[PDB]
Design an enzyme around this catalytic site. Structure first.
Site, PDB file in Angstrom:
ATOM      1  N   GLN A 192     142.383  78.086  61.051  1.00  0.00           N
ATOM      2  CA  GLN A 192     141.583  78.518  59.895  1.00  0.00           C
ATOM      3  C   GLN A 192     141.123  77.380  58.990  1.00  0.00           C
ATOM      4  O   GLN A 192     140.226  77.598  58.154  1.00  0.00           O
ATOM      5  CB  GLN A 192     142.394  79.505  59.046  1.00  0.00           C
ATOM      6  CG  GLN A 192     142.458  80.902  59.593  1.00  0.00           C
ATOM      7  CD  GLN A 192     143.308  81.812  58.707  1.00  0.00           C
ATOM      8  OE1 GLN A 192     144.531  81.656  58.605  1.00  0.00           O
ATOM      9  NE2 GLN A 192     142.657  82.737  58.039  1.00  0.00           N
TER      10      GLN A 192
ATOM     11  N   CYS B 265     150.661  86.620  62.203  1.00  0.00           N
ATOM     12  CA  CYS B 265     150.882  86.164  60.831  1.00  0.00           C
ATOM     13  C   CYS B 265     150.253  87.221  59.925  1.00  0.00           C
ATOM     14  O   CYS B 265     150.442  88.415  60.176  1.00  0.00           O
ATOM     15  CB  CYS B 265     150.334  84.750  60.641  1.00  0.00           C
ATOM     16  SG  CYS B 265     148.623  84.440  61.348  1.00  0.00           S
ATOM     17  N   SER B 266     149.510  86.861  58.871  1.00  0.00           N
ATOM     18  CA  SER B 266     148.862  87.932  58.114  1.00  0.00           C
ATOM     19  C   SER B 266     147.567  88.393  58.789  1.00  0.00           C
ATOM     20  O   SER B 266     147.412  89.587  59.070  1.00  0.00           O
ATOM     21  CB  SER B 266     148.619  87.472  56.674  1.00  0.00           C
ATOM     22  OG  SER B 266     148.223  88.589  55.860  1.00  0.00           O
ATOM     23  N   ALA B 267     146.639  87.466  59.092  1.00  0.00           N
ATOM     24  CA  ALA B 267     145.397  87.843  59.786  1.00  0.00           C
ATOM     25  C   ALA B 267     145.491  87.729  61.309  1.00  0.00           C
ATOM     26  O   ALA B 267     144.656  88.318  62.020  1.00  0.00           O
ATOM     27  CB  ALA B 267     144.226  86.990  59.281  1.00  0.00           C
ATOM     28  N   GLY B 268     146.491  87.022  61.806  1.00  0.00           N
ATOM     29  CA  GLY B 268     146.627  86.790  63.249  1.00  0.00           C
ATOM     30  C   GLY B 268     145.650  85.787  63.851  1.00  0.00           C
ATOM     31  O   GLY B 268     145.320  85.915  65.043  1.00  0.00           O
ATOM     32  N   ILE B 269     145.196  84.795  63.085  1.00  0.00           N
ATOM     33  CA  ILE B 269     144.299  83.760  63.622  1.00  0.00           C
ATOM     34  C   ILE B 269     144.702  82.334  63.240  1.00  0.00           C
ATOM     35  O   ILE B 269     144.400  81.386  63.976  1.00  0.00           O
ATOM     36  CB  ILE B 269     142.829  84.037  63.208  1.00  0.00           C
ATOM     37  CG1 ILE B 269     142.664  84.028  61.695  1.00  0.00           C
ATOM     38  CG2 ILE B 269     142.364  85.363  63.792  1.00  0.00           C
ATOM     39  CD1 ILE B 269     141.197  84.197  61.242  1.00  0.00           C
ATOM     40  N   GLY B 270     145.356  82.136  62.096  1.00  0.00           N
ATOM     41  CA  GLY B 270     145.652  80.779  61.646  1.00  0.00           C
ATOM     42  C   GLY B 270     146.941  80.164  62.163  1.00  0.00           C
ATOM     43  O   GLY B 270     146.903  79.376  63.121  1.00  0.00           O
TER      44      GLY B 270
ATOM     45  N   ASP C  33     153.802  78.344  51.331  1.00  0.00           N
ATOM     46  CA  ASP C  33     152.776  79.248  50.801  1.00  0.00           C
ATOM     47  C   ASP C  33     151.385  78.607  50.842  1.00  0.00           C
ATOM     48  O   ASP C  33     150.388  79.293  51.105  1.00  0.00           O
ATOM     49  CB  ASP C  33     153.099  79.654  49.347  1.00  0.00           C
ATOM     50  CG  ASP C  33     153.952  80.925  49.220  1.00  0.00           C
ATOM     51  OD1 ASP C  33     154.555  81.406  50.196  1.00  0.00           O
ATOM     52  OD2 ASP C  33     154.030  81.451  48.082  1.00  0.00           O
TER      53      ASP C  33
END
Ligand SMILES: CS(=O)(=O)N1C[C@H](O)[C@H]2C[C@@H]1CC[C@H]2O
Length: 282
Positions: free
Chosen positions: A262, A215-220, A181
């Protein structure tokens, strides 16, 4: 500089934040005008993460062709990836429309549906064989065929049917279930094992459309996956593997989607993964 000794030099000097801020300063800035149109507000999860106009994936629809997704095309490595946000309640049908239209074989998911007590993406695939999902807005049917649960990841076989034409296709869902997390994993060993399982399936190969990774934002986390994959492929292709410069590869990928990697901890983890992975390859 080489990678493994540049790595020790940044650790000993404690300058990961400065290296990462340099990358942020040099990264490309291109317009994202379609993402910001008012009619697309409920198609974006985060107001500060948008696809560039020049590289965005278009849906094959005349009403509204917008999805928060980008095509990352790596010319020397001969790999392409689609990076996208975790689907929203009002974009699950668009998500599977994209998978169909782009001829993808595999979907790579790097988050859990709930993390830190909040929802990070919709439950966009079926959890039981006998309870299939129908997406009426895009006329697709999705069925769970089989599921293999392992200690760090789960692989699912899914059937996607285009209800307009009755054509069917097999999609592989690769779900990395153990990213913490907070922070990054202590060792890259399970992440690399997962990358190799995706590779072995054919989902990254040129006989299929690009893999879809989110993932959640698609960048990290998503950025970490494609950065490690491309760097390892370049080390195999070149006469001099020590010529591969992970910072230059990351800046190339940021021409196609903003914000990849990120945090400075994700940057350090990406170095660690490529370093360890290059020893196992041989
Ligand atoms: C201190 S640093 O800039 O070299 N860097 C590493 C350190 O362990 C801390 C803080 C920062 C980013 C990640 C975290 O692990």
């Amino acid at each position: 500089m080489e990678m493994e000794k540049e790595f020790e030099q940044i650790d000993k000097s404690g300058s990961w934040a400065a290296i990462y801020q340099d990358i942020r300063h040099e990264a490309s800035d291109f317009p994202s005008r379609v993402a910001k149109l008012p009619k697309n507000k409920n198609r974006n999860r985060y107001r500060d993460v948008s696809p560039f106009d020049h590289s965005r994936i278009k849906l094959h629809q005349e009403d509204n062709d917008y999805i928060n997704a980008s095509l990352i095309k790596m010319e020397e490595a001969q790999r392409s990836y689609i990076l996208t946000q975790g689907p929203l309640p009002n974009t699950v049908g668009h998500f599977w429309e994209m998978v169909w239209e782009q001829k993808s074989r595999g979907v790579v998911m790097l988050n859990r549906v709930m993390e830190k007590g909040s929802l990070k993406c919709a439950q966009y695939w079926p959890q039981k064989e006998e309870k299939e999902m129908i997406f009426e807005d895009t006329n697709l049917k999705l069925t769970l065929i089989s599921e293999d649960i392992k200690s760090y990841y789960t692989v699912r076989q899914l059937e996607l049917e285009n209800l307009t034409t009755q054509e069917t296709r097999e999609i592989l869902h690769f779900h990395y279930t153990t990213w913490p997390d907070f922070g990054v994993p202590e060792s890259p060993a399970s992440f690399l094992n997962f990358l190799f399982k995706v590779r072995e399936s054919g989902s990254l190969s040129p006989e299929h459309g690009p893999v879809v990774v989110h993932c959640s934002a698609g960048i990290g986390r998503s950025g970490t996956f494609c950065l490690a994959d491309t760097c390892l492929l370049l080390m195999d292709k070149r006469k001099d593997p020590s010529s591969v410069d992970i910072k230059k590869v990351l800046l190339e990928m940021r021409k196609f989607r903003m914000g990849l990697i990120q945090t400075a901890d994700q940057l350090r983890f990406s170095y660690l993964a490529v370093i360890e992975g290059a020893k196992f390859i041989m």
